[PDB]
Subunit: 405 residues, 2 copies
């Protein structure tokens, strides 16, 4: 940076602390990642100066010839990546992508069926304090109490009983592969649309490491950040038949001007994901998650669903008589960043929880491999088995420092 340090010492100092924090800590929050310098440069471009309401070649303002190229590159690369017939790369966030799909197919009060929030579903999949649960009538399907795998007979029964107009699949804390084919079969049985929110797994889908929802869902929403490793933002994918309606939902429906600099950054991120080395990266993410899962089990931890098929895992801390809140706090003390997370059938509130959620996308981006997974698990074991020992915590702190250098 050249101009910020001189113009705004306070903001620069805080940014610099954050940069140094990102390097020093072990980031295990499952949605987190580190974008490339090219992605950041795109976001820091003069494209922030351009008003571009509308779509490429169909703008409501002049001078968009070049930002049109940028947006079309984003859309075409997204289509290549996911085999979708249409992309909308304007959503400001995953929340806004979801909001737009809901706005397209639902009327106020319509019934929607989504994953139980305390079993891994997202806030925007029907929380009563979120617009989704306030605007629409959400019902929930659950995971099996033993296997923690989505109960597809429960999905079907809920669908048949409640007759939702829309079924939502996908999750913020579900460590196994989702069967999109079964979701579409159930949707077809009850005449519901299927929306898949692939935010967490989008990078894995792009790398062919998780089944692609595109062939099965009427609408697929996603973040551009997370495993896809792009800038913060949203995207919607759909078949040509819904394209006009989806685009109209985003604008003039729910947003105004798009963030063209962020859209440039999306294009960059999609370009990266199209490369062979991104595929290799994504495989290491999943390999690392499996290794970390195995190593945590070796430490004596119980994992929700007994392991992982993807980038993330959930530790059920009940056997150690710890809450997620307690575990999250003490790991913070040693430089490991996780989040408390409800586990299926959690006896604790979502503000306390019986679990921690862990993901490997961020550490994999930093070049961590299988050995590092073994060591991260050993440190977590050391810490959580010795919550009252400052000497143990200091040892952990030194081991974390050894990992981040």
């Amino acid at each position: 940076m050249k101009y910020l340090p001189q113009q705004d010492p306070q903001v620069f100092a805080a940014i610099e602390q954050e940069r140094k924090r990102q390097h020093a800590k072990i980031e295990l929050i499952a949605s987190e990642n580190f974008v490339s310098r090219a992605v950041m440069e795109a976001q820091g471009s003069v494209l922030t100066n351009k008003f571009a309401e509308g779509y490429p070649g169909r703008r409501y303002y002049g001078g968009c010839e070049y930002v049109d190229i940028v947006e079309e590159l984003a859309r075409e690369r997204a289509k290549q990546l996911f085999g979708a017939e249409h992309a909308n790369v304007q959503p400001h966030s995953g929340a806004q992508a979801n909001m737009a799909v809901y706005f397209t197919v639902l009327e106020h009060g319509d019934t929607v069926l989504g994953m139980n929030l305390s079993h891994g579903g997202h806030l925007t999949h029907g929380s009563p304090v979120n617009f989704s649960g306030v605007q629409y009538n959400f019902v929930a399907y659950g995971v099996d109490p033993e296997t923690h795998v989505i109960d597809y007979d429960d999905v079907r029964e809920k669908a048949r009983l409640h007759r939702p107009k829309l079924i939502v699949a996908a999750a913020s804390a579900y460590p196994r592969i989702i069967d999109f084919a079964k979701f579409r079969e159930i949707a077809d049985e009850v005449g519901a649309y299927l929306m898949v929110d692939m935010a967490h797994i989008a990078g894995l889908v792009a790398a062919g490491l998780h089944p692609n929802p595109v062939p099965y869902a009427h609408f697929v929403t996603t973040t551009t950040h997370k495993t896809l490793r792009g800038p913060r933002g949203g995207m919607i994918l759909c078949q040509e038949q819904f394209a006009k309606q989806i685009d109209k939902a985003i604008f003039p429906g729910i947003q105004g001007g798009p963030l063209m600099h962020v859209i440039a950054a999306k294009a960059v991120a999609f370009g990266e994901a199209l490369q062979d080395d991104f595929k290799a990266y994504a495989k290491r993410v999943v390999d690392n998650a499996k290794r970390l899962a195995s190593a945590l089990q070796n430490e004596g931890f119980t994992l929700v669903s007994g392991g992982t098929d993807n980038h993330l895992l959930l530790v059920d801390l009940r056997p150690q008589q710890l809450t997620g809140k307690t575990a999250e706090k003490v790991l913070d003390e040693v430089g490991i960043t996780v989040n408390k997370n409800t586990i299926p059938y959690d006896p604790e509130s979502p503000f306390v929880t019986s679990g921690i959620r862990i993901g490997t996308a961020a550490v994999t981006t930093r070049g961590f491999g299988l050995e590092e997974m073994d060591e991260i698990a050993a440190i977590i074991g050391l810490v959580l088995k010795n919550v009252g020992s400052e000497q143990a915590l200091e040892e952990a702190r030194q081991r974390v420092a050894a990992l981040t250098d």
Copy 2:
């Protein structure tokens, strides 16, 4: 840029075309501006990597100590700038800021009173193709057919007849000062909340060149771009009594994670606006608009409301028997960027229009002054009085080039 040119030749080439376009053209779109290099650097920072759901000191994820400093700097500087008791700097856009206020005080189907869209009101103030008009029952007040000034007796009559729960004031194409005191008086008479959408005029308000809505409105929404000259995004200001509810509307109500890099950029922009030289800038914006208005009248153009009190003006093209669409197209041919705009009581559709809207914020940022205003008006006169003369258009093109260098 260092990394983007190597990583993504296609995206870089398009960005570079856009950069060169921004310099070559005369930007007169009233919402447009050019941000500082410091603002762009903040947006291009590693803060895009940080998940920060919640608010400073009350986050739902760990590691936010430094992004908390950044967000608090944004909020405190906004409060200083506008004399507001509370700021929410998380809205992704002006649309989302509006959406959140609506979500806070309204139920589905509630009546809202806003400015007539064809008299200068915004899409999010009740368009039937926007969420605002679909979710809530919007009624409209108008401007006087002669003076083009808001008819406050019409505001009052509409309020008394329709009994709105909320009254919205503010506009995208209104060239005169809005009387927030009268809006609040009317609101009080009918027991309605008052929301002011100051997006267009926020920079002028910060510089003390337009009356401040904060003392009069329960809620003030704004963009951070436009006359405020910040990054693209939204903000809400309100009294302490609404703070908790407003914050809850943004999250978990309508958004998820905030864009922390954009919030850093907002802080930077607010820092700039707090400086004396921003006040001088804003005065030049308004001085330039008045000069341009006068010079356009000297050319024989009729202006909506007969002039301007702010950064923008509207040309009523009926005396020249031109549509806004025709004028916008031919000015595009010579390198002047305007937008067609409906004028009050326009006999044309919003897709054709009888007007063009012009603003001086962008050219003022580039250092244009009164002489340049005179020349811009003379070029517009040359072009619009000679739409069929390629020689005139080539002369205009050369004069535009002389201005941008």
